[PDB]
């Protein structure tokens, strides 16, 4: 197959560098165009910095979808990587015109925009991929499989967290990290959240947005058990760089995974010794392998994870010219995300009331 002609909006900036890495890694893409800043001097510079044909460097995402859709050489797919109050204005321009969009988390900035974009995205024939990179890890996907086959039986408990420390001093945590924890939660567990209760705080004086969240969680009944969970996210917890973690408890055993040591999945069958499952090592399931690149003991990590999303989206894109083993996060996952955030905010404002 011919590499996918890829554009970018936003970037210039870790998150730009990450997406561009994610797309070089498995060599499924070539990055040929970009509107990476709204103020032209900066755009032109950034293109200059990436080696982009200046023919091919814009400063208007709207201008850039119009021309590129005409171009015979035009982009086949676009990574949207603006701040999220702009995800919707941007993606609808490309989806509108048959260009696949690979969008960064969370979906939007408001529930209103989330709903519109779904509609846009649903109307289009172009693919729409949401980049929840953490569902991308081999061991995270193995968990999903294991649980789907009932390796720990009915789910009773889903315990989820995501503390960081970077705002100890000096849109909030629920929307930025909280949603990842939530989405990681449902992805692994196979459950639907039915209702939640949230206590949010902005600890850091001067700060209007929530920088910590405690959330009680009630799940829809699957398999005769009505699962519960909790969720914590925080940006004021010294000692934590990026400690996303998920813990699942069934009627037959448990599964523990920590993003910071991603190559490990802790599996304990009830009545048995806990077993340490490894990426690419024994016990590694099919679903894990399909996104593994190197031998056991040879640490894959965050970028390899992000790339897993770009590679699946690719396998799908090709099939727009589809393998049922291909997974990636959808507009409905992002749909769910925004409902989650809205409801946390509504809850805490209503003093911890249950919301669905």
């Amino acid at each position: 197959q011919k590499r996918i002609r890829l554009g970018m909006v936003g970037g210039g900036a870790f998150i730009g560098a990450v997406h561009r890495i994610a797309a070089r890694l498995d060599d499924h893409y070539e990055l040929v165009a970009g509107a990476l800043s709204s103020t032209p001097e900066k755009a032109e510079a950034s293109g200059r910095e990436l080696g982009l044909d200046p023919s091919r460097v814009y400063s208007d995402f709207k201008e850039m979808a119009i021309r590129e859709a005409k171009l015979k050489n035009g982009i086949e797919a676009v990574a949207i990587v603006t701040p999220n109050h702009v995800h919707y204005a941007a993606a609808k321009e490309f989806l509108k015109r048959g260009i696949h969009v690979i969008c960064d988390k969370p979906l939007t900035s408001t529930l209103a925009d989330a709903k519109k974009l779904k509609k846009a995205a649903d109307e289009s024939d172009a693919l729409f991929v949401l980049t929840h990179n953490y569902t991308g890890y081999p061991m995270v996907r193995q968990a999903r499989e294991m649980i789907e086959n009932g390796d720990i039986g009915a789910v009773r408990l889903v315990q989820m967290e995501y503390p960081q420390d970077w705002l100890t001093e000096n849109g909030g945590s629920t929307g930025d990290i909280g949603t990842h924890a939530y989405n990681l939660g449902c992805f692994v567990s196979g459950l639907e959240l039915e209702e939640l209760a949230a206590d949010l705080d902005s600890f850091v004086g001067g700060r209007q947005l929530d920088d910590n969240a405690h959330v009680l969680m009630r799940f829809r009944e699957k398999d005769g058990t009505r699962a519960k969970g909790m969720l914590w996210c925080s940006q004021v917890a010294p000692g934590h760089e990026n400690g996303l973690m998920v813990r699942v408890y069934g009627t037959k055993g448990g599964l523990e995974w920590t993003q910071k040591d991603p190559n490990y999945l802790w599996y304990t069958p009830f009545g048995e010794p806990k077993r340490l499952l490894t990426r690419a090592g024994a016990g590694a399931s099919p679903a894990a392998a399909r996104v593994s690149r190197i031998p056991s003991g040879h640490p894959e990590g965050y970028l390899e994870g992000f790339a897993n999303i770009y590679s699946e989206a690719a396998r799908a894109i090709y099939a727009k010219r589809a393998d049922p083993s291909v997974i990636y996060p959808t507009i409905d996952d992002g749909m769910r995300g925004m409902t989650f955030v809205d409801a946390c905010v509504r809850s805490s404002e209503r003093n911890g009331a249950w919301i669905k």
Copy 2:
């Protein structure tokens, strides 16, 4: 100093073997008496087993207390290891007749008795000590100290948990929820103001909760109103006995896991995170006083228990005391009981915040 003559009620069962080791370990106590059972056939079997003078093996704590108070050679303190509904009953007899009581947790089974049992201990001139064994660990006491000095600044978050997996196939809140609550309040040194809970009885036929999820709001302090979470559970395959506490403040954070009780993870904001060790570099006075062997030689669960017996020993010698002596009181016990009550009250009300 002449040893402490000690009696027991109940045990004679893990629980009783543990207090007996906890008493023996530091050599502060000779165990001389005991109502080890309600049926006399056992009570004598138990006594003969513990190698006790049958003169001194009873089968009725009330008799046992009446007799030992007047007995001149008689027990100076007693350890109550019965089930919770019995504590108040058992304990009132001994505090009446002025002998000291080392009680197992929780205080009671009902709020009403706990209420009584405070009035008994408040009236008495004897000591009441409660075995929140887990507050006996040196790193747990070092955390309490560092947070008390200002080491991590004003406390913002207390994250508590306690999962076991034995009941996968009297409930979790009262059995283990308390230990966790107590650990949280012990280390962070804060007063819980209000809570909201969601309690589940996952197992079919099990009436009592076997899981709890609890949101915590603490009394403002250092100009900061902290919040927290508590999970406990008996149905979580993977956890044998995983009590844990994590504490975040304006200046840094501290984490302690009871399965590896000999370590304390201290990270000051902006700085590499440090590994704090029992009896090692960076060990503080509070830990030092309750440590017996050098760094690297693991202390543990029996030793955290023994620390509570010995802290109590110290206070007992002072009644024939150092400001350094600390042990869980009746009030700690009471808090524990208001806590369980409020969880159960809140949860019936669909997580209403309760004071």
Copy 3:
């Protein structure tokens, strides 16, 4: 069963540990003791331990004889003196039929170690060597599984023991032995020959504070195994890090004493398994030396107490499950320390 009357010569951290290891299981009661040479310290300590002053001696020789006569006389004695005072103190109690629990290592000199093995053979009282570290339940699970061929035939037996305390009689004899002895206890193998490079890193220090040692074991289940041993007193970051890893044809095992309740077992071509004290897949040999449920950490003392109790059990006799470190163990221990010091002085020569 009447508690064993025990007396003590010597002891100091080390005296305190033994008295705890005595008290823990309620098997023993401390009646007599000669805790010092100077009679002033020896009255005082007795006074503190609340012993009977009638029972406080200041010479171990007067102690054996007197106690040996008495009908309230001690049924056993804990020897916790320095190394060069072991043989002297112990023989006096074995002569007269009172049991001896001696700390490690056996003696300060190989020659005395030979004399003592003799005194112990002749004698009809038991001789327990407190190689405490062999008392951990998870250390005994290790021995139980390897014996049964759970990890097939042993190929490698990697041992070490760094400490950091002398960063500013040396490590081999002091800690090197503990780990030689642990490797053997666990594998079931007999050392054939070694080759060793020792250092006295710190200026002014005469004794070696580090040791690297190559190892060869006797053929056994067909395979002729090897191993290495590092010990040290100058490795910052280590407090008391004894550790042992054994690899076979079928699997491998790792145990570290700083986190003693865990034993890492991986069977070949299968996911590694975290075995725990009192937990699922706690083997028999583990259970019989465990007090409390899983997840409730047991430690140094409990293990030390394990020895004391197995000593108890032997004394009450003897259940052929009751194992403890023998005189011959302490003997192999000396020969090892001997060979190493020999081997280094001849620049790494293999010795046996």
Copy 4:
């Protein structure tokens, strides 16, 4: 600024060098000699989408034609097995083409001595892919000891066990050796080895124990130890190294590469992390994402490719480090000194 046209010889682990190369966008891969049989070569040029103009079946030819081209590769990646290294590399070195070669240097001490000749002659760079020297913490570890953060070095304890074959000293022993030297800042002086081939029918070794003696440095005459092994179940890829000095200690395991364990004697042990607090400049330059976002084994590999790149750009920075022909040589010597010493029942060799 303009990418570096790149060739490769081998592959068809080639994938890893290809990943390493793409990762930072410094190279474009244009030509290749991915196999000896001329069809398997075309096919693989085809799997990768190389212009068939530029798919070769013999390296010597490839080198020639490319050196002539105006589209000629500016660098070649030699990823063939060891015994082919020299043949290939000398053809690109001869003609001004930089060569990034995978380890080890060669399969004979003879061959090696010749490559150093070809390398030293050439004006093209010779880069040896010691990926593990690539990791940010491993460079942080080197920097600190350079800086005397743990005082004079006394111990260098290093091991590398794997489990898959339940020739070792050459396949993994050397990585362990070089990494210890890389981090430690020392020169091995002499070693005594005891090598082993447990598994029947295996001619080569699959275990090695070896004591080590370095050359007096800062008044201290360090010692170390080294174990590698391919028959040690439980171990996937257990490369690890620990260094103890007069004032401190450093520990690092490659299976959890983002953590460096620093103990300052007398003080509590510290967990140092990639891009985290207390990360150091040597680490900074080679890290791509924030603390807590784990970089790994490919990232370490792409770090060597990205320092070669920087080296190349010049020859068109005293910060830019990479493993040289010499590191390669020291390695060939090491392995020889081993086998030699073992055969002589563990004799100290130099």
